Amino acid sequence: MAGNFDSEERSSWYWGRLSRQEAVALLQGQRHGVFLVRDSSTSPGDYVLSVSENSRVSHYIINSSGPRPPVPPSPAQPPPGVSPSRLRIGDQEFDSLPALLEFYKIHYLDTTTLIEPVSRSRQGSGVILRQEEAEYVRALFDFNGNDEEDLPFKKGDILRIRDKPEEQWWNAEDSEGKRGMIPVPYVEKYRPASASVSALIGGNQEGSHPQPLGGPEPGPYAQPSVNTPLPNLQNGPIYARVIQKRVPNAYDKTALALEVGELVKVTKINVSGQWEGECNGKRGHFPFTHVRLLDQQNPEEDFS
């Protein structure tokens, strides 16, 4: 708004252009599980992934681009990007960054058990200081880690939410006073009562139902990867009306009938592009080439 404006920075995991030691030093002797994404790779956009474990960090190579990465096609080179997106790493290939980091939601990762974005370190210029809240959560496992920025969780201990710095880790305080972040797929979501009330805000000049633009506030209305093993939901994927009509084959059975108009959510995302969605309460797998996929696509992304 003022003479400064912004974009992301204080959004979630992404890290800044780590010179060279930052991305390695900051991820070195870190927690038993940690990963980070710095900007220093080929293509139009930077894609890398360093993971800690025991002996130095493990930087991984990743590929990506602006075009839509729903399913792996056979194109040549995107107009804006440098070449076909598609992700890479350890003889692997996903489609989206958030889709990649979303590996611990199912079962461990390349190295260690359930990793997460590293603290800040590497000498940061920005410090968090927000007073956001929501309903509180309880720890379902013992406490233990390495990074001071995060907050170890002690079984049966109740933690109050204060902000969402990651897609798999929210910020909460411990019964000792210490502040930090707790895991999403390790605690139990608890809903007391004083969570969905807000102030008021009100309106001024309305008439019709607006579109889901901007993005809802973090909380019960929209929480990070809590039930999504693959599909992302940092602020809310594309939810409106199918862009193209794609019906199921006659020889099909448990297939989904997709038609431009209705609204479908991405329920269950496979590796080779074929994902399943919810349309008219029906759950089935459609080509998905007639719908606007989800992952890491933002209008004002400014990736390139």
UniProtKB/Swiss-Prot annotation:
Comment field on protein domains: The C-terminal SH3 domain function as a negative modulator for transformation and the N-terminal SH3 domain appears to function as a positive regulator for transformation. The SH2 domain mediates interaction with tyrosine phosphorylated proteins. Mediates interaction with SHB.
Organism: Homo sapiens (Human)
Origin organism lineage: Eukaryota, Metazoa, Chordata, Craniata, Vertebrata
Feature type site, description Proline switch: 237
Cell membrane is among the record's keywords: yes
Pfam families: SH2, SH3_1, SH3_2
Principal subcellular localization: cytoplasm
This protein's name: Adapter molecule crk
Residue positions where Phosphoserine is found in the record: 40-41, 74, 83, 125
Residues of the SH2 domain: 13-118
In-chain residues carrying the UniProt-annotated modification N-acetylalanine: 2
